Chains A and B, each alone.
Chain A
């Protein structure tokens, strides 16, 4: 990685899985020479490792670094969950939030001031259950038969709107066209004008399907 940033001054870099994407971490002052030309050293050093590099800045790294600590937390906290006053004091000492942290050391959080019977070791289990709950949410969006490609690729409807429409037994765009404004009015996410426009669009796609 560093050798591919030469001739310049590399200091650090990030990693990943298949597409690690070497995130070059240098300083603006040294970035001038490191980057050299917008379309020259950014491509020459891209094939250096064979994959691709993402030249960044020392400050940029930290900026993105924090944009990761808050998110295993910055995601509406859809994992374990209990009281919030204890959750703040737990996430203060907690490294990398709780996102799948049960596979890590399950003995250093017991050092935290307040660890009687295995409950925090249980709080992490709740996070695991939250992951299963997230899989159940996938079942709510796939685990229980989500809409077809005709209904999903319909213009004017998103994935959540397609799921809300398909939750009433419909599966295809023709099934959505068979439903009425009053039948789609049972879902509060769709309005009468929006359900009318979606039904008209599905009926137009069904009727004018012979024309491209």
Chain B
């Protein structure tokens, strides 16, 4: 539901599932061109330190 969950998983792990399509790969590349998501990161589960509970 959140793009943080998309950033938590690798692009190779998403490419190993056929739920994404060929045009969806191009859309994912267009989204990752801004380098805000799908940059190959690893989170704790959800929250960064700036994302703190208060």
Contact = CB atoms under 8 A, between A and B. Distances in A.
A181 B22 contact: no
Contacts of B15: 203
Contacts of A197: 18
Nearest to A178: B22
A195 B17 CA distance: 11
A170 B18 CA distance: 17
Contacts of B17: 196, 200
A15 to B, nearest CB: 53
Interface of A: 177-178, 180-181, 195-197, 199-200, 203
A180 B21 CA distance: 6
Contacts, number: 18
Given A180-B18, A196-B18, 13 more contacts: A177-B22, A178-B22, A180-B21, A180-B22, A181-B18, A181-B19, A196-B17, A196-B19, A197-B18, A200-B16, A200-B17, A200-B18, A203-B15
Interface in B23-50: none
Contacts of A181: 18-19
Contacts of A195: 18
Contacts of A199: 18
Contacts of B19: 181, 196
B39 to A, nearest CB: 22
Contacts of B22: 177-178, 180
A181 B22 CA distance: 11
A196 B17 CA distance: 7
Nearest to B16: A200
A1 to B, nearest CB: 58
Nearest to B15: A203
Nearest to B21: A180
The 6 closest A-B pairs by CB, nearest first: A199-B18, A196-B18, A180-B21, A200-B18, A178-B22, A181-B18
Contacts of A200: 16-18
A117 B29 CA distance: 72
A24 B19 CA distance: 58
Contacts of B21: 180
